């Protein structure tokens, strides 16, 4: 996988325009790219008041299965593994996308301000593969419903947020 991040331009211009726009905007560079994101750390409202104390901040001032052990589980899944996804949660994802498209084909009579209802067809398989990995987290040759449904909810929240 990839990792792409840097200080965004115009400060927080990312808030006004798309979740992207850390670098140039041209829609051609964005073509092969798949997923965009924003990070929440514990400083958001420091832009209204706390900034004062912030500069005053300048003036007047493991608990988990070990890192090597996660690498060990990962090398032992590179060795041999078959934790595939489950058909029922798979059809549940298919539902919570297609029925969204049907509610919105019905709501086209409302003439939504959403520019152009896109084909969420690569993001969908992205969610499918992330639930596959969350099933790899549980060795189940047919995916357990817990991790798959959690990932489903969280990625529909993500996709929905992006659509918003």
């Amino acid at each position: 996988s990839v990792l792409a991040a840097a200080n965004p331009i115009y400060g927080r211009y990312d808030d006004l325009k798309s979740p992207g726009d850390n670098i140039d905007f041209q829609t051609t560079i964005l073509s092969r790219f798949d997923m965009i994101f924003i990070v929440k750390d514990d400083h958001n409202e420091e832009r209204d008041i706390s900034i004062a104390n912030h500069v005053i901040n300048i003036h007047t001032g493991g608990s988990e299965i070990s890192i090597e052990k996660m690498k060990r589980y990962i090398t032992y899944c590179r060795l041999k593994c078959a934790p595939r996804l489950s058909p029922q949660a798979a059809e549940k994802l298919s539902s919570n996308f297609v029925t969204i498209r049907k509610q919105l084909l019905i709501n086209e009579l409302e003439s939504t301000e959403r520019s152009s209802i896109p084909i969420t067809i690569r993001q969908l398989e992205a969610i499918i593969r992330i639930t596959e990995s969350l099933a790899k987290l549980e060795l189940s040759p047919i995916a357990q419903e817990r991790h798959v449904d959690e990932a489903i909810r969280l990625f529909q929240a993500s996709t929905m947020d992006a659509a918003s």
């Binding site: 400060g11 832009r47 209204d48 008041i49 900034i51 004062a52 500069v55 005053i56």
Partner: protein
Amino acid sequence: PNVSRTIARELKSFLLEYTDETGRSVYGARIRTLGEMNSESLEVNYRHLAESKAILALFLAKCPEEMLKIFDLVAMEATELHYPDYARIHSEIHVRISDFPTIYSLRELRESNLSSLVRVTGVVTRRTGVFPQLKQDSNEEIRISFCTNCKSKGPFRVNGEKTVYRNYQRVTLQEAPGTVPPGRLPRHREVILLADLVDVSKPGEEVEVTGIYKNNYDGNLNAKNGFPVFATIIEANSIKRRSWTEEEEREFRKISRDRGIIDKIISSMAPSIYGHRDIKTAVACSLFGGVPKNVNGKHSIRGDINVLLLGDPGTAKSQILKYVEKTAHRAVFATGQGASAVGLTASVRKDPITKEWTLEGGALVLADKGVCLIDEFDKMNDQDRTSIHEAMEQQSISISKAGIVTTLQARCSIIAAANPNGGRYNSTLPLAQNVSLTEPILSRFDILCVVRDLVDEEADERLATFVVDSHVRSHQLNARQRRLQRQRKKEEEISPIPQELLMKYIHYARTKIYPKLHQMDMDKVSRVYADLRRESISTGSFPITVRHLESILRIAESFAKMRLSEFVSSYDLDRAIKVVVDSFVDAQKVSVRRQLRRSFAIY
């Protein structure tokens, strides 16, 4: 000096057994600090040795390097008889000397001074990497009598290796910019860095070297066979990276304790200008500078103003920044014609003649801890614009290039004289649209001096009277008295503070005072900032960000330095908010008139 065995003895009487003011041997401490630190370099406090034995100190003129080479070996045997382990720890130790009274500036060096000791100031223009210097041709490579098999004409080839290598860093030192009189190119002197002093210095930074002044040649012949390239080279022996009279600062305070200083300075900031108090105010503000403050928490925020002067033909802006070039301490005047981005910022090259990597301080680098003055922005290529934007944001110049890696620091402020696209200000139209400069670099600046030329039946008459009187006043021991005092009478025709006072003033300020704030108004000024944010969202688009706020305190601290308060005051913070808010006001459209009331809640 051959019998100098006894002389080395007599100077090694000072070696360990000297103490003063309740013991505590000057070098009894140094020997153990070396035994515990292993820095292979002795300090020699020249102040105390000067008291010790005058002949030894004076011996730094006839054979000073021979003197020091005799001295440091016995210092080595001294720290070895004190620490019998130390000789094996390192390979060899060379001493360093504390200070001299001889402050020969680079503009003053003579043949009498060469081979003697000299202490010079200046700035590291540019530096190189470590050299494995050469130093029966021992280090000749130009002297081969009959050591060749085909010596008649068939050439024999010597290697350039298997030869002794000395840690060798050739640093170019040039005269401090600003002090250089206009027209004269600043001198260059190659100082030499060695084992302990290697890489201890960077470019763009002030230095003071204490080395000897050798007349040594370089084997890069390049001209003729029996003729190396002879350079008058300084051999470094101590490097210092870094005063005025008491009653001077006393009457200085006596003046600066008045109430009119914050405006007497303004009215004396510009010697021959009519009007433009607001622009003179911003000039003074970004001249004094504010207290910077490193931030390891999020990002180091510099306390250094950056004025962009959106000029207009006729308005004396270039004359203002020329005055600034003269008055400030570290001015680097550079125009957008000879920009060549490689020039403004630092760059790293290979020299074709010697095949050596060097990295040369740029205008931003050459100006560090000062003011870089650029003009005709819109008359420079966009790549220069990009590099300068990068430099302003990081207030420094990192570099990781072919064969080199480091990070020069370029705190220095920027003053910029611009010129709106095409001709003048079109109308009340927005400042951004009025200029071909990018929004990022626009926001990089904090203050925007908007000047404008407007026809007036009267104000121009008074201004004209002023300018004509200006061109009027322009043009032995007792004659020099009657001349100096008459120049000072003209200094008083512009009634506020005379100039020399003001340059000593700015030096004093940027040196000693570092004001701060109290909790009291900072949240009420954040309240005023929120009120500005609502007046700006009522304006549609606007660059009102953290920069626009931080500018306020960055200006108020300058105002405190003006007042020499060490802590912000009310009236000064109100001055700061006034300047920032109306500098913003000027940038905006017709709304300006509405704005005169809209964001008026402050005033």
